[PDB]
Ligand binder design. Structure first.
Ligand code: 5Q4
Length: 303
């Protein structure tokens, strides 16, 4: 048949971890900064805790818990465990610099070509891992890429992520982010690893423009026709034709014509070896970005 998913779901006691502050309090739920102190392990792990009780919200949170427990890659957000309180809490690694979208907006004047191209390689690596795992993300964007360190980023938000068996995912209704979606996804609700490639193109565009909103002011209903006419996002000023051509290729009508994530890794790696030949940023190179006794990072806390 199909391969058994032998992932281990860890249940954590509310007493094993201590909340410190609130990082974000969105309409969907709250995200807290905290510390996880397992059993008598003499370690302190900096965590993110994502929590009225409704049976439907628990069903969705447990679905995201399933997906996250089933992924293990340096460029994919790792689930540490769940805490079965009144409302189910997801415990994950603290990404202390927040989302990449806000990070690029906040640090425009200090982000160099090396960092941008490295982020691109890193996102493609994480994305190619999900492809190996037959996982279609369906919500890749700069807001869904977390920053561990300025030199290390990870893909997050598996709220829409779908697992395949033997080529495409046919969706139902639900609120979807139109401006990051492939044409087939808009017109037919079809999602594939190649639809994630389109979203990857937009994510790269977001970074190269230092956090600009795609199609600013254009309503989501117009988008479908804008794409059908053969219009795409403009060339960011810092982008050479070399980089912009990669973006344009991710935005082909024919999904099989778009690049594969494994090709995006290669393409961006070659560029990352000589960043100034591919991105033109004024004042580049001179630019630079950044009880604790038993504190250990989750990436170093294996079991
Ligand atoms: C809100 O971001 C998310 C989007 C989708 C899914 C999950 C998250 N939140 C997660 C999930 C896992 N780990 C994390 O650290 C986070 C997170 O948001 N962390 C997070 C968020 C914000 C910060 N600050 C960065 C500096 N800034 C000036 C103030 C806020 C730090 C960490």
């Amino acid at each position: 048949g199909e391969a058994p998913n032998q992932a281990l779901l860890r249940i954590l006691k509310e007493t094993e971890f201590k909340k410190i502050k609130v990082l974000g309090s969105g309409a969907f739920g709250t995200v807290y900064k905290g510390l996880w102190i397992p059993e008598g392990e003499k370690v302190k792990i900096p965590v993110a805790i994502k929590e009225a009780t409704s049976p439907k919200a628990n069903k969705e949170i447990l679905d995201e818990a399933y997906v996250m427990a089933s992924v293990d890659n340096p460029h994919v957000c790792r689930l540490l465990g769940i805490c079965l309180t009144s409302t189910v809490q997801l415990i994950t690694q603290l990404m202390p610099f927040g989302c990449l979208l806000d990070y690029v907006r906040e640090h425009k004047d200090n982000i160099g070509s090396q960092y941008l191209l490295n982020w691109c390689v890193q996102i493609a690596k994480g994305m190619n891992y999900l492809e190996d795992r037959r996982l279609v993300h369906r919500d890749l964007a700069a807001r869904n890429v977390l920053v561990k360190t300025p030199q290390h980023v990870k893909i997050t938000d598996f709220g829409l992520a779908k697992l395949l068996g033997a080529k495409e995912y046919h969706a139902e209704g639900g609120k979807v982010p139109i401006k990051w979606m492939a044409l087939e996804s808009i017109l037919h609700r079809i999602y594939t690893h190649q639809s994630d490639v389109w979203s990857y193109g937009v994510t790269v565009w977001e970074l190269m423009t230092f956090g600009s909103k795609p199609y600013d002011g254009i309503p989501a209903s117009e988008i479908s026709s804008i794409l059908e006419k053969g219009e795409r996002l403009p060339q960011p000023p810092i982008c050479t034709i070399d980089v912009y051509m990669i973006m344009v290729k991710c935005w082909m009508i024919d999904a099989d014509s778009r690049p594969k994530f494994r090709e995006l890794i290669i393409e961006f790696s070659k560029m990352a070896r000589d960043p100034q030949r591919y991105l033109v940023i004024q004042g580049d190179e001179r630019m630079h970005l950044p009880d604790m006794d038993d504190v250990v990072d989750a990436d170093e806390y294996l079991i």
